[PDB]
């Protein structure tokens, strides 16, 4: 039964990796940041309330212009808001009503949305024929789609419920590579700022780091007790934050291949369903599941800010590319923008 | 002051009026989640999406036969679904216990805490000849102490013991349901089997509607 020997070097390799991580975790983050000054309870308010969605706002995404933002509701509605004039720039009916994610191309010319039909639909915004239309039906996944993010106007990276992330050439219509290796459904992928690599958190408590071109994993991290719901790379592209059903967040630093901090509290017992850093990084927006969102001092793991606002599950979150606000889309069908 | 943004706001209010129109066409349609283990091809008599109507009331039923079998995530989606058609077989391999723990999980979930289930216990007749010609106690022991309560109307002709088995299964599921959270939601267990179960779904939807309104009015 040579497989037993296989498991044997597997477990000794796990022991070797953990021992090396002990040899690399020789002073935790909280030890040295202790000497630094606090921040103070940030008194963020609402600034706008976007109210046009017939069903739970399940996903959201700003645009690079830091004014427009797309939002997807599971009544089957993908609507592009302008914030300042709070106007419904576009409102898009979908081929199927159940969607778990929207995406806004950094060029601003496309949006992408997908969900329980496994497909990623990419819609052309800046068409010259008037109304917006679905440019591409990226249909190769076997489970549902949970996150989609744009590299550029032509290639999309999409994580599914079949435990595979993927890279598609949008123009071609077929998948560039299949980032396979996970054991639980991928729940959130986060592109590195340089788009040379990206993290993905899944329902096996493990976060994987891949190489966008070689099409193969490069690291796995495990410091979170339960399924990973949300993930967001640091502005550096060196660390990332993960949020899980354990009701805590974790910093996974990419160079040290391990964890740095935990964001936990005695009161919180609800699975956090969204996460994202601010632009600088010193704050961390964790959209919890007791209807609130918390603002964690990422370098202190204290709770500073509390954005309450909502009257249901906050199912998405995202800061502007210029750090101008936070959009929170809950299950009460309101997007609250916060300065 | 809305120099060219006046026309922007004009198109915004036109699309917002469109949002009102499809609010009319949404709040009046019944989203129900199929959850299998049939009639779904017949329940659309009038691939994944399934739309039909009864008494000018429109039903949008989502079947989910396209996912991997780890549901703890892609089921939260249906916290706003009207009902769950929970199509479980009557002949159990141990199918009845897996169905039982699936039903229990659905009932207990924090998002589906306030969703009524419609229980369909398929193939009751097939179970009838199965357990008549030759079993139940071989999987559930507490079937030996069980007898059909007098408030259970049988289908005349078959064995009172077959009816006893059917109602034992139904009594297990309703023990699940009542064991926690009768304040918000209720199981409506039918006994499928080749009739119009569409009428059963429609009447149960009316019952759930009326119960929710009576519960906001502080009556039920």
């Amino acid at each position, epitope marked *: 039964s040579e497989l037993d020997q296989l*498991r044997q070097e597997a477990e000794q390799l*796990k022991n070797q990796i953990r021992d090396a991580r002990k040899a690399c975790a020789d002073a935790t983050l909280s030890q040295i940041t202790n000497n630094i000054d606090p921040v103070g309870r940030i008194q963020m308010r609402t600034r706008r309330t976007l109210r046009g969605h017939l069903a739970k706002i399940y996903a959201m995404h700003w645009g690079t212009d830091s004014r427009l933002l797309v939002s997807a509701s599971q009544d089957g509605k993908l609507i592009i808001w302008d914030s300042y004039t709070t106007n419904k720039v576009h409102a898009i009916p979908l081929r199927s009503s159940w969607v778990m994610t929207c995406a806004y191309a950094p060029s601003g010319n496309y949006v992408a949305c997908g969900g329980l039909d496994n497909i990623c639909s990419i819609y052309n915004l800046k068409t010259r024929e008037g109304n917006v239309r679905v440019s591409r039906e990226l249909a190769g996944h076997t489970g549902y789609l949970s996150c989609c993010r744009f590299l550029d106007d032509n290639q999309i990276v999409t994580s599914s419920g079949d435990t595979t992330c993927a890279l598609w050439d949008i123009e071609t219509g077929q998948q560039t590579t299949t980032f396979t290796g996970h*054991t*639980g459904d991928v729940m959130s992928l986060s592109l590195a700022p340089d788009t040379r690599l990206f993290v993905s958190g899944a*329902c*096996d*408590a493990s976060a994987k780091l891949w190489d966008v071109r070689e099409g193969m994993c490069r690291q796995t991290f*495990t410091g979170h*007790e*339960s*399924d990973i719901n949300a993930i967001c790379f640091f502005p550096n592209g060196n660390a990332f934050a993960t949020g899980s*059903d*354990d*009701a805590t967040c974790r910093l996974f630093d990419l160079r040290a291949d391990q964890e740095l901090m935990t964001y936990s509290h005695d009161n919180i*017992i609800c*699975g956090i369903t969204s996460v994202s850093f601010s632009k600088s990084g010193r704050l961390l927006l964790a959209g919890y599941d007791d209807f609130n969102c918390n603002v964690w001092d990422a370098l202190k793991a204290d709770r500073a800010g509390v954005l309450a606002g909502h009257d249901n599950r906050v199912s998405c979150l995202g800061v502007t590319d210029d750090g101008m606000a936070v959009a929170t889309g809950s299950w009460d069908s309101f997007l609250k923008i916060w300065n | 002051l809305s120099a060219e943004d006046k026309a922007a706001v004009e198109r915004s209010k036109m699309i917002e009026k469109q949002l009102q129109k499809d609010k009319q066409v949404y709040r009046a349609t019944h989203r129900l989640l199929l959850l299998g283990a049939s009639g779904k091809s017949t329940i659309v008599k009038q691939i994944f999406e399934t739309k039909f109507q009864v008494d000018k009331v429109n039903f949008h039923m989502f079947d989910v036969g396209g996912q*991997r*079998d*780890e*549901r*703890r995530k892609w089921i939260q989606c249906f916290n706003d679904v009207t009902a769950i058609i929970f199509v479980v077989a009557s002949s159990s*391999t*141990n199918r009845l*216990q*897996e169905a039982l*723990n699936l039903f229990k*999980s659905i009932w*207990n*979930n*924090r998002w589906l805490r306030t969703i009524s289930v419609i229980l369909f216990l398929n193939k009751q007749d097939l179970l009838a000849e199965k357990v008549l010609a030759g079993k139940i106690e*071989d*999987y*559930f*022991p*507490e079937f030996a102490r069980y007898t059909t309560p007098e408030d259970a109307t049988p289908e005349p002709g078959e064995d009172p013991r077959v009816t006893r088995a059917k109602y034992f299964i139904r009594d297990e599921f309703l023990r699940i349901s009542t064991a*926690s959270g009768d304040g918000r939601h209720y199981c409506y267990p039918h006994f499928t089997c080749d009739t119009e179960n569409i009428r059963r779904v429609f009447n149960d939807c009316r019952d759930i509607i009326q119960r929710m309104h009576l519960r906001q009015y502080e009556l039920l």
Partner: nanobody, 128 residues
Framework: QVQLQESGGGLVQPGGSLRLSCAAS????????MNWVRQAPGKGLEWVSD????????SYTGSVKGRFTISRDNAKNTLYLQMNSLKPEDTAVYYC?????????????????????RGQGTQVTVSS
């Protein structure tokens, strides 16, 4: 890592006894309700037992109640299953599982042999 080691199991004669056990690292063992699952050769899986956070609320499959018993020492972070008066049909691989998320009365564990928070499994055979 959320790892669940199991121990105990082998060829035993019918009617005998056995105490298969589970040492779990990678979570606060208190917060979840544990499980025992099994796969009998030629068959899929099935769930056998349940024990809650405190272990007050417990449950079994019909064909093992009274016969088998499930206990958990949260202080020692371990889950025990005492099998007694076994049967030829009880030969199967036994996996210690934990429910996906904490502080809940909800569980989605058994699968098409595709699940993340169960141990590797100890064989248990009941034959001559």
């Amino acid at each position: 890592q959320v790892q669940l080691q199991e121990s105990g199991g082998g060829l035993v004669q019918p009617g005998g006894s056995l105490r298969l056990s589970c040492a779990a690292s990678g979570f606060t063992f208190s917060n979840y309700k544990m499980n025992w699952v099994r796969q009998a050769p030629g068959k899929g899986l099935e769930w056998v037992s349940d024990i809650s956070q405190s272990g007050a609320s417990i449950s079994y499959t019909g064909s093992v109640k009274g016969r088998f018993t499930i206990s958990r020492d949260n202080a020692k972070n371990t889950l025990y299953l005492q099998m007694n008066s076994l049967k030829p049909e009880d030969t199967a691989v036994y996996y210690c599982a934990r429910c996906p998320a904490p502080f809940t009365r909800d569980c989605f564990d058994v699968t098409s042999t595709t699940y993340a928070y169960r141990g590797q499994g100890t064989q248990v055979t009941v034959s001559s």
